[PDB]
Write a structure and sequence with these properties.
mitosis; antephase checkpoint; ligase; monomeric; binds zinc ion; 31% helix; Herpes Virus-1; two-stranded antiparallel ribbon; 4 strands; E3 ubiquitin-protein ligase CHFR; two-stranded antiparallel sheet; mainly alpha
């Protein structure tokens, strides 16, 4: 496929098929990759970067897909900045929506907790990343740190796990009594019924699956 990117040489540009009517410069032997976020081609400089840390990262270190954001700035409605060190990743203004088990009732309790104290999702992440680094909190992508360079999606995923543990560590006396009165759901955090408003309001889902007595 003929590909022309922001950094392709002018002679390549003019040689493409015309439309229908009613510092770096890509070399000839070089290849392009499509940014996973915006689908725009960029020069594929990953191999070069393996022996040259001066080249900007072009992939998520968790999922290993390519992203253009650190390389030359990505732009798309919906993209907040799709590749960044975890501690600097922009998760967007609505990152707390359904942040707990995709459960808006549990999420809103948390939002209230934070709003009450003037805390932002940012302060909460910062505090969580401290616990993570000491081994107090854990991640499924267990080797991720605040310094890991990753994508919006992989960062969001670990942010949900960290946020869950943050919520878990809030004392029951710091939450409305309307919250702490609710009985634990037998099925705990992975309950499938909690996407229904009535069940979600009635039972607490910040807990683990009930096994024996
Ligand atoms: Zn190019
Ligand atoms: Zn990723
Ligand atoms: Zn992009
Ligand atoms: Zn992007
Ligand atoms: Zn339930």
């Amino acid at each position: 496929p003929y590909v022309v990117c922001r950094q392709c040489p002018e002679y390549r540009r003019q040689a493409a098929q015309p439309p229908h009517c009613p510092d770096y410069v890509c070399p000839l032997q070089g290849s392009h990759a499509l940014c996973t976020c915006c689908f725009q081609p960029m020069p594929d400089r990953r191999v070069e970067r393996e022996q040259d840390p001066r080249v900007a990262p072009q992939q998520c270190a968790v999922c290993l897909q390519p992203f253009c954001h650190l390389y030359w700035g990505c732009t798309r409605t919906g993209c907040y900045g799709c590749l960044a060190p975890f501690c600097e990743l922009n998760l967007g203004d609505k990152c707390l929506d359904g942040v707990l088990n995709n459960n808006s009732y549990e999420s809103d309790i948390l939002k209230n907790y934070l709003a009450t104290r003037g805390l932002t999702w940012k302060n909460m992440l910062t505090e969580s990343l401290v616990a993570l680094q000491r081994g107090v909190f854990l991640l499924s992508d267990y080797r991720v740190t605040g310094d890991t360079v990753l994508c919006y999606c992989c960062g969001l995923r670990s942010f949900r796990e960290l946020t869950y543990q943050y919520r878990q560590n809030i004392p029951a006396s710091e939450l409305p009594v309307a919250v702490t009165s609710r009985p634990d759901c037998y099925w705990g955090r992975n309950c499938r019924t909690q996407v229904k408003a009535h069940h979600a309001m009635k039972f607490n889902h910040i807990c683990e699956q009930t096994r024996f007595k």
